[PDB]
């Protein structure tokens, strides 16, 4: 699948309220940080002699992932997220051919 | 071991034992929620006016009755 590098869509900001040009980037998940509340609880439980205390997923079935795009406006420093369907190869091209 | 898969043999008899009840008449549960909004809003303004007229009508009946 090919996607354009820029889109024109409704901004929605109170100071714009009109169609403007956005820059397209692909979302990527951030690093799992220490000292997150769930991570702290997991580390406390794992310490000791019990062994493995939580399930570990093994039998994966999916071969794709949904695509999330981050759109940034130049006029207003705001970001919007948009979801596309599942695909095996996502590329950004302005060639339009 | 294998068993029966599916059947509908006795179901009609069960449904008619306490009968198949009829529908609710049309003048009950006739809510207008979800209908075309512009017509809904205009009808609300008329109903508000009618309630004020109903209150005024009762006051006149009371005064006339007291005057005999």
């Amino acid at each position: 699948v090919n996607y354009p590098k820029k889109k024109v869509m409704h901004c929605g900001d109170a100071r714009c309220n009109a169609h403007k040009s956005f820059k397209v980037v692909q979302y990527k998940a951030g690093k799992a940080r220490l000292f997150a509340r769930g991570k702290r609880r997991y580390d406390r439980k794992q310490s000791g002699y019990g062994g493995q205390t939580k399930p570990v997923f093994h039998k994966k079935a999916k071969t794709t992932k949904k695509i999330v795009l981050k759109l940034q406006c130049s006029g207003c420093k705001s970001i919007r997220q948009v979801v596309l369907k599942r695909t095996k190869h996502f590329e950004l091209n302005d060639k339009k051919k | 071991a294998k068993s029966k898969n599916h059947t509908n043999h006795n179901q009609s008899s069960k449904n008619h034992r306490n009968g198949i009840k009829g529908p609710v008449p049309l003048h009950l549960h006739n809510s207008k929620r979800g209908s075309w909004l512009p017509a809904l809003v205009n009808a609300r303004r008329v109903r508000k006016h009618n309630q004020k007229a109903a209150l005024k009508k009762r006051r006149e009946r009371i005064a006339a009755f007291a005057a005999k």
Binding site: - | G19, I20, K21, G22, P23, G34, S35, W36
Partner: protein, 157 residues
């Protein structure tokens, strides 16, 4: 195996022979208002706002009107009770129902008779039953019997 939305509609959602085509202008100019009786008959050439196959051929009451759509209330039996289902369809899939044509004619005739009686006009004569007796004068009389030729003409070979 498969239980899709439009399963088993090969002959149900099809046009009659030499009667294909999109809806005409009479359908577009028909007026529908809340409280009317309509028949839900799917038009297979529109493919927008089509009712489910169950409601094809049912008669109901209009409860909502939108710019291009109509809301209809349809009775549907489920187990031991009857449900009033509200469906949303495009205006091209409904038509005005004649299910009360006879009853409306009955009321109008009664009003006309009432007016004539008050005006002192002449009421029409009353029909008489055909199940009464009487004299019959025959014009042509024939004998009914089984003939030999009847059996011979029953062996096509």
């Amino acid at each position: 195996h498969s239980y899709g939305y439009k399963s088993g509609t090969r002959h149900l959602f099809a046009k009659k022979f030499r009667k294909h085509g999109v809806p005409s202008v009479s359908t577009i100019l028909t007026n529908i208002k809340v409280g009317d009786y309509v028949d839900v008959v799917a038009d297979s050439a529109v493919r927008e706002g089509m009712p489910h196959k169950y409601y094809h051929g049912r008669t109901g009451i209009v409860w909502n009107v939108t710019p291009r759509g109509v809301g209809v209330i349809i009775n549907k039996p489920v187990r031991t009770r009857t449900l009033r289902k509200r469906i949303c369809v495009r205006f091209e899939h409904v038509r005005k129902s004649r299910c009360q044509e006879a009853f409306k004619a009955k009321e109008h005739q009664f009003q006309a008779y009432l007016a004539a009686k008050k005006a002192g006009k002449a009421l029409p004569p009353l029909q008489k039953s055909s199940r009464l007796g009487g004299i019959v004068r025959p014009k042509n009389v024939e004998v009914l019997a089984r003939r030999v030729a009847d059996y011979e003409a029953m062996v096509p070979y």
